[PDB]
Each structure stands twice: as C-alpha cells, then as structure tokens.
Write a structure and sequence with these properties.
5 copies of one chain form a homopentamer.
Chain A lengths: L1 E16 L4 E13 L11 E4 L1 H8 L7 E3 L7 E9 L4 E13 L11 E10 L5 E9 L13 E3 L7 E5 L12 E13 L2 H19 L7 H25 L8 H22 L10 H21 L3
Parallel strand pairs in A: 1-8
Antiparallel strand pairs in A: 1-2, 2-6, 3-5, 4-7, 5-6, 7-11, 9-11, 10-11
Helix pairs in contact in A: 2-3, 2-4, 3-4, 4-5
PDB class: transport protein
Keywords: Pentameric ligand-gated ion channels, Membrane protein, Ligand-gated ion channel, transport protein
Assembly: pentameric
Chain lengths: ~300, ~300, ~300, ~300, ~300
C-alpha cells in the first residue's frame, strides 16, 4: 500500500447557497508520497509546472487522480506543480476553486447553523492509503466577525475513514475499501442584518396592527384593518424578494403568517363586536383585547419555541 | 455483437427547472465489456486515468462513445478511468454532471408529480448490445423527506428497448435498430412551503374580502372593495415574483383569478343593491350574501376539481 | 464541384429570447459526400469517433467546415463521428446544441407568431455544392400543444439558394457564389397563460375603475380614483416584472396605458362636474358616463385593431 | 515593413450594457498580406481550416497575432481559415463574437446617443504596418428602425493612426510606434418604448397629484396627498426595477425626484393654508395654485434643459 | 537567485461586487529576467506568440509560473508573447482579465471607501527574486470623475515584501520565504446618485410623516399614520430591490429603520394624546411635537455620527 499525505489550505469560503445546498471553496491542495528514487537535473529537487506535468505522465510517471466526492462539477484548477525529490518523494501542489455540496437545514433562518464538509477519495486505487490529513483553515477567527456574514466556530475537524463499496465487480475477492478524508467546519450565521432590517420592522407592523382597537368607530376598525392587511402583504413581498427563496417555511416565514392571522382574527373580532342583542357593540371586548391581543400574540410566539 | 454492461450511480438530482423541462444529475457511470485479451504490465489489471486514456485509443484501443439522448449540451465529465483486465474485460469508469430534458406537466403546481428519465444509446454502433442496466439511486428514502423539496417514490425502474431509426442511409439492408437504456425515477413535489406561505395567506385575503358586506354604509362597501382589489393585485405580484414563472395556468394561478372575480362580483352586487325602486338598499341581499358569497366560492372551488 | 447531402435532426427548440432575438436548438447534423475510395480495415465501413477524427485530417483527409450563418457564438458540439465507406462515401454525424439568431416582431405579444431559421454555408469553399437538404423536425404536432408554450404550425420548409458575396478578393474572376441551406419553422405562441393571468385581471381592474361613478358624494369620487390610480400602477409593476421586458410597446403595454388614461380621464370628469353655475354638480353627467365611460373604452379598443 | 490589409464584417451589434460600458459584436474578420511565395499542392491556392493552422505554424509559418485593444476578455472565435496563395499572398479569415468596451454617457437616457468603437493593433510587431481598413457594416439602415432598439446614424468611419508607447524597454532606440485601426459607429437610442410606457404614465401621475387642490375640505387634501406620495414611490419602484440600474441620475430619475418635490411642496402648502389669523383657510391660495402648481412644474421643467 | 522585473498595466477596474468582495481587472502583465544567452534566427531578438510558447518549454525553456494570490479562479489570459533577446534577456508579455478578492467594509455605503489590491508571487520558486515592480494605472484622474462611479484617489502604491510560510516540508532547512508584490489602489465611491435618488426621497418621506400632527381630528391622525407605515415599507422595498443586498446594516438601512421608528412612535403618541382624564385630547402635545418630532429625529441623526 502507498502512503500519501495531504495538506489542504482554505483561503476563503464564500457563495453559500442554502437552496441548492452548495458553497464555493478557494484554496490549495498538496499531496506527498514516497516512490522509487529518480535522477534529477542537478542534485536538487526538480519543479515541473502545469503543461510539463502531462509530459512526465506520458513518460510513465505515476500521479494518482484524487476526486472530491461531494464536489459539484469539475472545479477550476489554477496552477499545478510537481516537486520531484531524488529520494523518491513527490509533492503535488495545486491551486483550486470548486463548489461543494452538503445537506443544509435552515428552518431557523436568522439563527441557523451549518457545517461545510470536504470529502476526498482516490478515484481508482483502493490499494493506496491516505496517511494523515492536515487542514489549514487560517481564515480569521477574531479579526472581523461581527462584520462578517458567517462565524466559524473554530479550526476544522478532520476524519480519515474507510468506505465499503458493496456494488462492485466480481473479480475483487476482498478489496472494496477506499480511504476517505472528511473535513468538517462548523459555522453560524450572523443574525445582525436579518434582525435589524427584517424582524424588527415586522414586529413594528404587527404591533401597530393591534392599535386598530384604539379607534372609536366600528366603521373605522374594519376599513383600517384592510389597510393593515395590505401592509402585511407588502412586507411579505419585501421579505421574500430580498431574502433567499426556500422550499420550506423559515422562522421569518412563520412570523409573516402570524401577522396574517393576527389581522384576520381582528376582522372576525371587530365584526363579532353583532354579538350583542339590540345592536350593543360589546365595548368590554374592544378594550379587553386592546391589550390582550398584543399579549395573545406574545403567548403564541413562546409556544413556537416549544 | 459486443455485450456491454452498464451501471449508473445517481448521487444527487437537483436544479429542477419546470419551465425549460430540465434537471441536473450528478453521479458516476460505468461500462464493462469483454474484448480481445491483452498483456498487462504485471499480471494484475491496469488502471488508465484521464489524459492517458486518449493515448491508448491512438494506439488502437476500442472505446465506444455512449451518448445521453435527452441531454442538454455536452455534460461535465470529471475523472475518467479505464480498468483493463488481461482476460479481455474492460471497465470504463467516469464521473459526470449533466443536464437532462424530459416533458413536465405542472398545472397542479403545489401537488404536481414528475419523473426524471435517463436515456443511453451507443453513438455509432448498432452491431453492439447493452446486456444489462443496474441503477444505484441510493439517495435517501427515509432520512430527510419532509425537509426535502422532492419525494422520490422508490427505487428507479430500468428498461432496455430497441429503437428503429427509419430515415438512414441506403447501404444498411436491415441494421437500423439501436439499443436504448431507459431509467425512470418517480418523484412528487413537497407542498409544505407552497401551502403555508402561499395558499394559506391567499385564503385569508380572499375570505377577508367577503367581510366587506359586514359594513353598514353603501359608500363604505365600494371604497374598501377597491382596497381589496389593490390587495389581491399586491398578492398576485408577490406570488408571481417568488414562484417560478410558467407558460400555463397552475392551481395557484387559478385561485388568484378567483379572488379577482370574487371582488369584482362584489362590486357588481354592492352597486346592484340601485336594484330596488325609490332608493331602497335591498338589505336582504347584503346580509344574504354576507354568508352566501363565502359559500358560492367554496362551491365553485369544488367544481374546479371536477 | 463536390456534392454534399445534409440531414438536420431537431430534437428540441427551447429558450426563446424575444429581446436578443435568439433561440437554442438541440439536435444532430449529418452530411454525406462521395470522395476518392479508400482501403478500410476489413471491407466494412470504418467508424471514427471524437478525438480520432483530427488524426485523419492531419494525415490529409478532407473534411470541409460548415458554418451556421445566423449562429450566436460557437455551439456546443457533443459526440462526432466519421463513417468512411470503402467506395469513397463519407458520412459525418454530429450532435450539437447552439443558439441561433433571427429577427423577431412581438408587438402583438400574447398572440404573436415567429419563425425559427437555420442558415448553413461552407466556410471557405465556393466550388462545392450542397445537393439536397432534409430536415427531420419530428417534435410533436398532435401530442402536447395546449399545454406547450409554442404551437409549431407544421413540418419545416427547406431552401437551398446561392449567395453572391460581392466584396471579395481580386483574384477570383467569377467564383463568389456560395451554397446556403436555409431551414424555416413556423410557430405561434400559446396565449392561454397570458390571457387568463394577465389580460383578464387587467379588464377587471379597468372595469372596476369605472365603478367609481356609482359613488354618491363628489369627495368620494376623487379619493377612490387615486386608489384606482395606485392599483393600475401596482398592476403595471406586476405585469412588467414577470413578462419579458421589451424595447417596444406590446398589446399588453397599450392596455396598461389605456387603464392609465381611463382613470386620468375620470379625474378630469369628476372635477368637471365645477362646470355648472352656482355649484350644481351636473348629476346628468355622472350617471351618463356611468355607462358611457365603459363604452367609450370599448369603442376606442376596437380602433386599436384598425 | 510588412503591409497587412484587414476587412471586418459586422453581422450584428447587440447586448449593449450601459453599466459596464460593454456591447457584443458578432461577425467576421479578414486580413491579407504578401509574403514569400510557396509551393502549393496543385497550383491553385490552398485552404487550411481550424486545427490544421497550428501545424503550419509549427513548421514555421508566420501568422501575426492581432489583438482587440478595447475587448473585454478573449473573444469566441468560430471557424478560422488560411488561404495561402502561391505568389506569396496569405488571407486569414475568421468568424468571431466578442465583447468590447467604450465609455458611454447616458444621462439623457431615453434620447441618448452612443458610438460603438473597435481598436485593432498587432500584439508584438511594430515593424509591420496595417495598410488599409475596410469595414462592412451592412446591417440595415432603412428596413426596421422604428421597430428596432437602436438607430445607426450611418456607415462606419475608419481611421488608422500611430500610437507612441513611451514606457517600454531600454533596447528600442526609436521603435515604439504601433499601427492602430479605429472603427467608430454612431447610434441613437429608440425612445418609443421609454416615452409611451414610462415618461407618459409619470406625467399622468404627476399631473394627477395637482388635482389634490380641487378637493373641498382641508382634511381631504392632506390624506389624499399621502396616497399620492405612495403612488410616486410605487412608480419610482416600477421605473427602477424594469429600467437598467445606473450609477448616475438620468432624465427619468430627475422626473421621479420632481414628482417627489411636487407632492412635498403641496403638503407644505396645504398645511400652510394655518397662515391666516383666526383659522381662515386662505381659499385664494388653494385655487391659485390649483392651476399655478401645474404651471410652476412646467416652468421648472424648461430650465432643466437650460 | 534570479532577478525578475515586473510591469503591470491596468486598463480598467470594473464589476465591483461589495457582497462577494470581488472586482474585475483587465490589463497586461510583463515580466523580464536575464538568463543564459541564446542563438536567435538572425541577430535581432525573437518573438514567440501563444501556441508556440509551449513548444519552446518542451525543448527545455524555463518560464516561471507567477500566480495572483488574491485571484478568484483562473483569469482569462488573452494574447501571450515571449521576447527572447540574444544576450539572455527574456520578456514575457501577456494580456489578462481576472477577478481579484479583497476585504471590503461598506457600512457607510453612500460614502464608503475601498482599495483594490493585487498580490503576485512565484508559484514554486523561492530561490527567485522579484527585483522591482512598476504599475501603470494610467486610467484617468482628471477627465471623468463626477460622471464615473468611483474616484481613484491617485497613482497606485507598490510594495515588495517577504512572506514566511511556516507549514512546509521537512527538507527545507531555511528556504521558506517567497517574494510577494503587493499593489494597492485607493478609491472612493461617487455618492451623487445615491444622494439624489435615495437619501433625498427618504428624507422627503420621513419629513412628510411628521405632517400627521397638523391634522385636526384624532381619527384622522391614526389612519393616515398607517398609510405612512405602508409608504415606508414601499420605500424599504424600492431601496432594497435596486441597491445591492448586503449581509450587514448600512447608512441607508439605518435611515429606513429610523423612518419605521418615527412612524411607530407617532402611532404611540397619537393614541397617548387617552393620557388626560375625562377625554381631554392634550392639544399642547400635538402642537408641541408638531415641531419637536422633526427636531428629535435630527438630534438622533447627529448622535448616529458620534
């Protein structure tokens, strides 16, 4: 079995797409193994860059193809180099920018947390072993965090394991285990923008919707309630045109429904006050829910976190 | 005839575009046939990766070109390998990401169901036969489904058939039948998001439009109806800016039209009560349709499913 | 002159862009001509796929380059093959996906009709002739049409002509005519969606805008007219954010202006009745145009189709 | 010095991007120079297409690289050919589609005018001369213009000049002048759509804002003015979501501000009439600016063109 | 150590993406070093363009790979040339268009300032030195500035430094320092558009919201306040659909929140005047904050700049 040591440098993780569950990763990847010795031009180790690499492979040099399992399409590999040491060591260095996939749950959208994973396996060789993996996610941790969109929880955690592919050929008696490197980086979303510019104005509108009971006339309460209904629809539009569309209901999507229900229940209550015989307007209801309707919403919001 | 066995691994099916009738498919494709034996370097089977594959073809190696029929443009092939066995067997392994096309009907948009198909044929050889097809759609079935946007109904169905191309040359006496592998995967759309954040608020607004009859004055009924008219237009905007545009009317598109008619019919009814001579306001109409107008909408909605 | 027979198979025509006047075309293209006989490996005809074609050209094989005239950028060619017959025949088969250009007039947007054209010429040879062109647009005609966005009027029309390039060199005495194949496919847009989800609600809003005259007070008429003005502006937004933006006025764009004018003309009339001395409200005007204003709009709409 | 004659055929100029100052150009480019004679296979001139061109260069053929200066990234070259004449002439013909950059001023947006420029220089040779440039902009001038988005003013003007690159090496005594071909095509924007569907409804809304003074009550004037404020914001939204966003203020952007100012000045005037002691409502102001406020806007609009 | 002199020509810096912290850079890059002399064909220096460069490398020519550190994906290299002087000098000239990354803080959005940086290092050689760097950012400084979106503060500053990569192999005793060229260009955003078309109308809306206290009736004050609430939501939509979305709160985003608070505080004050026993309307409050509410906002705005 061949021993191959990898080193993955993460320069930047950006372009997080919660819908397609994808994220771009820019950086370098280095792999080193020890093979049969070689005569270098001059004793010092040789450097073979980019196009010259394939010429060495055509002459018989062994360079294994390592595939990112969870990658989304072939990544954009920049400069690539081979450092051939005379004692048999071979160091492959390559700059890459690629999009990777991992399951993402963002139902608690403003305060959700995800993990970015990378998975590396040899494409064709099972008789070759990844000896140790060292990541270098030296992006900042306490430089810009309150300003940045994501908060990395800490240095990445690595994991080398063996995967048993069952569905294979009929000629392998026992060789169906491959070496997989699985790196994981925990992260939490910065809720600053989504609190100040979305949850706060929603509360202001939802709270202002309860001030309909402080109007004197019954005719005044129903017509202004229709205007409040339009205002929630207007905010539901703004909150959906700017926020990323998603195939499931988020925390914010629920608050929008909550504002819809608050107003629709008000219209029923206003028409209700029917309730009394001979045209009495049940003024003890308008004044009671004048403060209870704000409280009933606050009581329902706490059971949302049950 | 040459016997070729295929195996298609589906990692992920994403990027479903109901408009262009396309969807992305990521995974691997393997093909195996037995040819003339060969002397390997060492007795064990050889592995030829990526750029080294074309060199063997230039020396005369036969590798048939397999084309995805329903593909949309040349797919993005990742790592490719040839495993040459000495006893004549040849295994072609390739990672691919490609966009495929199939007809999609989504008139019942929140509750529609589609199937994703793959169709594989040899590009130039009719005297060569695809012996058996095995798909490996080992994406989850009971892990994340309520959270996911699509619900796969179950393991994919395979189908090998023969296609008769009529319009061909004049030199083939009888050889105009090609072997087609047809994989089909059934799936149903997750209606959770589209119900809670779209159909539900639509019902609330449509219902609240009927509360115009609980107003006392005739002047009150017409002006608030214009506000209701504006409210439906505002919701038709939000529901069309976030939902995928389509060249036909969906279930939701029909509900939007229904809300328009409900309000316009109300404006006609409010003006109608006108009907009575000497300025009578036909108060038995306002109170009758106060509950009947909600019921007439429910009766028409049931005949929509006729 | 060399005789070259073409055959173009159209799988799918999608991605119609009325703005840039482009449309994607996926399918295969076949060309056959008879050249000097050849010794095949075995008597039967040879098949040369993909990378191996250029090797034969480097050894002197004549393969003419055929250019799509109206193409927009180099198309995406899939699998390509050469079928070399021993008696001299050569069959070139290639799968392609390309974007093509043709002038498009869509002023009658919901009910417009266009034609998709392809234009094929030899790139460098005028002393070579395209003998006959056969298209195979075997997309459905009676399968899905009401569900589909476009209605193909029928099988495509072919056309081989000669183009006289005047501005050329000074060494050709008379050879400046090239063979052009021009394929044309007629099509009509499916107006189902654009009628139900756009033209219909506009009429409802425009008609409901005429219900302002059934209000009793003069103060009531002006304020609801401003709400109607906002409603048309709101609909003008929705109709332009979802429909494709265009550099000219369509049928729908004219109706939008018509709703603007209807309301603006109403505001002038309401203020007019302012006209009468001593504060008379000209009640014979409000009631007359109560029905005439709908009719004047219908009368003006008929002269639009003049 | 080597004499090189160019000929540039412009099929279509589309995709004008006023923001990035870019525009797409599709067409052909031909270049001809006379070199050392050559032995052709057969006496007639040879045609070398696409991949075969590099083989002749590897054997020593001189083909100079001509670079588009104002290009934005490497263009998409279609088919390329070399016509080698035996008397030394060489004709290079290539189809290309590329994006070019040029400064664009569009402050008078609906009625602005621009020019599309091309600049061609040899990439490495200063001891080689571009003898004459002939453009073939045979796009229509009198076919479709009112229907088309841009109006080409007339046939393109050519211009060959010399550029003095100062910052160079230290080994060139005086050879720092290169030959530049500069083609310029004038064009004016079709204001039909932007007049009918934007400037016209803006005037309708702005004018209708002045009808607030024809209301009788002071309470009526302020509340409807707030509705007018919402209508302008709604139109400012519609006019900015469909029109191309720009980093400077256009003619339409100024009218939007003008509508904002008209309404805000009205709100100040309505509150003003606060001005009079003992609660007098200054009815001579409401009626004066009832027509003067429309006139003051018309007077301010004329000084905008000062 | 090899001495390498660079020269970087910047034609244009466009496509600034404050979200992804990226910006496109088009221009040329030149590098010159002196190596072992060579026999040129003729005494004068040779010019090797594009495809012919790799042929010289296959014959043993040393061309070091220089990588842009902060680049985002492989850049688009246009024409590339090698000027081989007989005395050993080698001049590499290449046209490039690439997107570069640098941290961007835009919290003071209309009046923020950024710097565009480029970072160049040899990819594999540490025993090679960049001797001096000369940038040529000869974009205008006094031509178009008020018209342009960004204001370049002045000529770029160069900086050659040494980077100590710690995490390296175990065979380098001390050679882990590479030569880095760091170019920096300061720039300030043109606030003309964002002031006239956004901050100005926002103040107009925010100020007009304070005119609610000049209404006479209490019922009038609350309902028009809801219309103002809808107007701010409408403007928050318009300002967020056109301005670039960002993961943090800007200057404009704070003003939007300020308008939200101004109105919600008004709704509380109107209901407050509850405050007085027996139904007194506290008219000394409505008139006091009639001017104080405008002043309290201005006082809060100054402490925003604290």
């Amino acid at each position: 079995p061949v021993d191959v040591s990898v080193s993955i440098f993460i320069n930047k993780i950006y372009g997080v797409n919660t819908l397609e569950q994808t994220y771009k990763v820019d950086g370098y990847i280095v792999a080193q193994w020890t093979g049969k010795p070689r005569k270098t031009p001059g004793d010092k180790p040789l450097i073979v860059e980019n196009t010259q690499i394939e010429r060495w492979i055509n002459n018989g040099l062994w360079v294994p193809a390592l595939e990112f399992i969870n990658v989304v399409g072939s990544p954009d590999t920049g400069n690539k180099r081979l450092m051939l040491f005379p004692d048999g060591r071979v160091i492959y260095n390559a700059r890459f920018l690629g999009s990777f996939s991992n399951d993402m749950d963002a139902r608690l959208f403003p305060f959700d947390r995800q993990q970015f994973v990378l998975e590396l396996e040899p494409f064709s060789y099972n008789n070759q072993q990844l000896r140790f993996s060292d990541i270098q996610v030296y992006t900042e941790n306490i430089d810009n965090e309150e300003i940045d969109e994501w908060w990395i929880r800490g240095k990445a955690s690595t994991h080398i394991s063996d995967i048993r592919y069952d569905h294979l050929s009929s000629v392998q008696p026992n060789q169906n285990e491959f070496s997989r490197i699985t790196v994981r980086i925990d992260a939490v979303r910065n809720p600053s923008y989504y609190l100040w510019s979305f949850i706060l104005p929603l509360g202001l509108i939802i709270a202002a919707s309860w001030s309909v009971f402080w109007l004197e006339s019954f005719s005044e309460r129903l017509q202004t309630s229709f205007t409040l209904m339009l205002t929630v629809v207007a905010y539901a539009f703004y909150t959906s045109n700017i926020l990323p569309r998603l195939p499931y209901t988020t925390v914010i999507d629920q608050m929008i429904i909550a504002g819809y229900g608050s107003i629709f229940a008000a219209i029923l209550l206003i028409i209700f006050a029917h309730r009394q015989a001979n045209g009495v307007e049940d003024d003890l209801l308008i004044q009671r829910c004048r403060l209870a309707f704000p409280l009933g919403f606050l009581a329902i919001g706490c059971v949302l976190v049950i």
